[PDB]
Curated annotation (Swiss-Prot), chain A:
Outcome, altering T306P: Increases slightly the interaction with RBD domain of SARS-CoV-2 spike protein
Gene Ontology cellular component list: apical plasma membrane; brush border membrane; cell surface; cilium; endocytic vesicle membrane; endoplasmic reticulum lumen; extracellular exosome; extracellular region
Phenotype when changing E92P: No effect on interaction with SARS-CoV spike glycoprotein
A single BP term in Gene Ontology: negative regulation of smooth muscle cell proliferation
Record protein name field: Angiotensin-converting enzyme 2
Result for mutant: P371D: Increases very slightly the interaction with RBD domain of SARS-CoV-2 spike protein
Function: Essential counter-regulatory carboxypeptidase of the renin-angiotensin hormone system that is a critical regulator of blood volume, systemic vascular resistance, and thus cardiovascular homeostasis. Converts angiotensin I to angiotensin 1-9, a nine-amino acid peptide with anti-hypertrophic effects in cardiomyocytes, and angiotensin II to angiotensin 1-7, which then acts as a beneficial vasodilator and anti-proliferation agent, counterbalancing the actions of the vasoconstrictor angiotensin II.
Enzyme Commission number: 3.4.17.23, 3.4.17.-
Substitution effect: F22D: Increases slightly the interaction with RBD domain of SARS-CoV-2 spike protein
Effect seen on changing R339A: Strongly inhibits interaction with SARS-CoV spike glycoprotein
Organism encoding this protein: Homo sapiens
Consequence when changing E294A: No effect on interaction with SARS-CoV spike glycoprotein
From Swiss-Prot, chain B:
Whole-protein coverage range: 447 to 496 of 1273
Protein name: Spike protein S1
Domain of life: Viruses
Chain residue ranges for the region called Receptor-binding motif: 1-50
Lineage of the species this protein comes from: Viruses, Riboviria, Orthornavirae, Pisuviricota, Pisoniviricetes
Subunit-level organization: Binds to host ACE2. RBD also interacts with the N-linked glycan on 'Asn-90' of ACE2. Cleavage of S generates a polybasic C-terminal sequence on S1 that binds to host Neuropilin-1 (NRP1) and Neuropilin-2 (NRP2) receptors. Interacts with host integrin alpha-5/beta-1 (ITGA5:ITGB1) and with ACE2 in complex with integrin alpha-5/beta-1 (ITGA5:ITGB1). May interact via cytoplasmic c-terminus with M protein. May interact (via N-terminus) with host bilirubin and biliverdin, thereby preventing antibody binding to the SARS-CoV-2 spike NTD via an allosteric mechanism.
Length: 597, 50
């Protein structure tokens, strides 16, 4: 009948076809991940071609429908999720060039190999060679050499490719009605037509900046403490007021500072919270990890979990004949089909990682009843926060004691709490300033804000301001160090990590408030709290059917982005860092550099 | 996929108690109503069970 009715019928048919197509593609993907063979790569090619062709056809068929004539909110959301054409908005030649540049850039990043000058045959890739080597070995010269070589043999080659990729990603965004590709990526958070919940793309930037300036004192105190520990370690390599070297942070980009935890441990004599010894003694396994996790979800009110996942999914190493990817992944293959990509050994890090992936699966089939387009998270940060909050809750000593992994005789003293809080800070907020810095730089690059013949320099300059980290040796504009990261080199948004950290903190605080938890936030266990589980599932079942700001307001009560849960979490650690930095200067100075005498 | 079993997707109107919908009724799946025209916006009336 009406154009809206025809659009509804078209969307129904598109959902019916796309569900089967995506299910077949996901089945082929699971087979290829669990079996890396030539025929598996062939069916990746086939499934990718089929999915891309169908997606483009349905994008066009949604495009000829005028989005203005549709009034149903769900139909409007589905159409606008489908009406986007991406790089195809440009000419076919331009889209092909952009795709080829992306493929070349991803290949160069993944195959980035550095060779020692004293041994031409000794060449090592970025992963797992360079990163692990400089994270374990603390040699200043080796870390500096690896950092410079990795950013040289990659950045120099990637700089013209990055300049093409950037403008190309920009021109599609432009034709896609966007000031820059940064705006194109921020359009995911954009909310339109919802009274009291509409969100502008630049509002994400402004909220991220406000949160960063809120955490600025805590970040400065953490930087001061790290600098003091490095003074205790390498006093001659850093100035007491100068910024930290880029190769003395645990990773070349400075994203993760957890590798410096050994150098920055508050109480080294105090043992870390680890029940891996009891994990081995109790003769548990990844299956027992999943069983305890399901019991925990039953305690928080989540329902039982289907045996089809148990049969289809793998929880340990499947030998070597059926070569399988050990990268942590959660798979919502569609139509009640779910899977996990794990190699969980008898450890605690793999325990928490499997918890996170299974929680991602739980979020996935929480909104399974939503249509095919709406069978996803509201934004790119909500999805990870759902796993993060429950992984943190299960990692608390109370849950471990309840499940028997941790002996009841374990005591929670001030020093152990401080060690745990500092480890959590190094893991979480050690990248939040870096996340904001890189996203804003990428934003600047796409919005063309930064100047090319100055880009890298400008980078280093606010590397001295936003991060308080200065490069050990200068890098010319030929260097493309930001593109040396996976997200930039594979066309991935970077603010997702900052947003997901904020969402995980807010959700954890809301769950603790609903569970009436008494004590520090870092000791909060959401176990045996069905009300909090129901409140969480209320948003979880929606997925992206509702505005993400609406979901945040429904869960935590705050529509706007804030780090108040982060402040509550790190307040004891903030006071501890303030006390510890009474002798060490808090902040950084942009003037000093390791290459300046 | 046991495609021998199929579910009707194209059906202009509703059904009556115990109605044999063997007829392959066709209704629009895109934008242009079929109205006796085959091809665009007129897919297969029913979809196989994968």
């Amino acid at each position: 009948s009406t154009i809206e009715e025809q659009a509804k019928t078209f969307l129904d048919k598109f959902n019916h076809e796309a569900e089967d197509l995506f299910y077949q593609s996901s089945l082929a993907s699971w087979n290829y991940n669990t079996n890396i063979t030539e025929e598996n790569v062939q069916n990746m090619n086939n499934a990718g071609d089929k999915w891309s062709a169908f997606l483009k056809e349905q994008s066009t068929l949604a495009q000829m429908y005028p989005l203005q004539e549709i009034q149903n909110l769900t139909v409007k959301l589905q159409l606008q999720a489908l009406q986007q054409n991406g790089s195809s908005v440009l000419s076919e030649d331009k889209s092909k060039r952009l795709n080829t540049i992306l493929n070349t850039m991803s290949t160069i990043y993944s195959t980035g190999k550095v060779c020692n000058p004293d041994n031409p045959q000794e060449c090592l890739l970025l992963e797992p060679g360079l990163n692990e080597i400089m994270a374990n070995s603390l040699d200043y010269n080796e870390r500096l050499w690896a950092w410079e070589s990795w950013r040289s043999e990659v950045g120099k080659q990637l700089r013209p490719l990055y300049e093409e990729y950037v403008v190309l990603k920009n021109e599609m965004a432009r034709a896609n009605h966007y000031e820059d590709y940064g705006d194109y990526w921020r359009g995911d958070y954009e909310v339109n037509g919802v009274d009291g919940y509409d969100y502008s793309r630049g509002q994400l930037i402004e909220d991220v900046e406000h949160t960063f300036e809120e955490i600025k004192p805590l970040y400065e105190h953490l930087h001061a403490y790290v600098r003091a520990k490095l003074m205790n370690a390498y006093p001659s390599y850093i100035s007491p007021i100068g910024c930290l070297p880029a190769h003395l942070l645990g990773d070349m980009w400075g994203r993760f500072w957890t590798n410096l935890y050994s150098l920055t441990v508050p109480f080294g004599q105090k043992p870390n919270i680890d029940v891996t010894d009891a994990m081995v003694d109790q003769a548990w396994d990844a299956q027992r990890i999943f069983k305890e996790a399901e019991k925990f979800f039953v305690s928080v009110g989540l329902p039982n979990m289907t045996q089809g996942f148990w049969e289809n999914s793998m929880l340990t190493d499947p030998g070597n004949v059926q070569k399988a990817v050990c990268h942590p992944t959660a798979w919502d293959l569609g139509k009640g089909d779910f899977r996990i990509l794990m190699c969980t050994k008898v450890t605690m890090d793999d325990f928490l990682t499997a918890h996170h992936e299974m929680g991602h699966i739980q979020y996935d089939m929480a909104y399974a009843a939503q249509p095919f387009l709406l069978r996803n998270g509201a934004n790119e940060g909500f999805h990870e926060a759902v796993g993060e909050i429950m992984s943190l809750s299960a990692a608390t000593p109370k849950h471990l004691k309840s499940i028997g992994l941790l002996s009841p005789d374990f005591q929670e003293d001030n020093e152990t709490e401080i060690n745990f809080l500092l480890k959590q800070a190094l893991t979480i907020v050690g990248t939040l300033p870096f996340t904001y810095m890189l996203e804003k730089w990428r934003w600047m690059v796409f919005k063309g804000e930064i100047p090319k013949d100055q880009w890298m320099k400008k980078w280093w300059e606010m590397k001295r301001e936003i991060v308080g980290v200065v490069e050990p040796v200068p890098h010319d504009e030929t260097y493309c160090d930001p593109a040396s990261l996976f997200h930039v080199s594979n066309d991935y948004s970077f603010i997702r990590y900052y947003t997901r950290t904020l969402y995980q903190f807010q959700f954890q605080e809301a769950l603790c408030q609903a569970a009436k938890h008494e004590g520090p936030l870092h000791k909060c266990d959401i176990s045996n709290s069905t009300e909090a589980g129901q409140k969480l599932f209320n948003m979880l079942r929606l997925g992206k059917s509702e505005p993400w700001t609406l979901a945040l307001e429904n869960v935590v009560g705050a529509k706007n982005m804030n780090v108040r849960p982060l402040l509550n979490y790190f307040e004891p650690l903030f006071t501890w860092l303030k006390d510890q930095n009474k002798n060490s200067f808090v902040g950084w100075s942009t003037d000093w550099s390791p290459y300046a005498d | 996929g046991n495609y021998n079993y199929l579910y009707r997707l194209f059906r202009k109107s509703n059904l009556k108690p115990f109605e044999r919908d063997i007829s392959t009724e066709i209704y629009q799946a895109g934008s242009t109503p079929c109205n006796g025209v085959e091809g665009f916006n007129c897919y297969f009336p029913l979809q196989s069970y994968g």
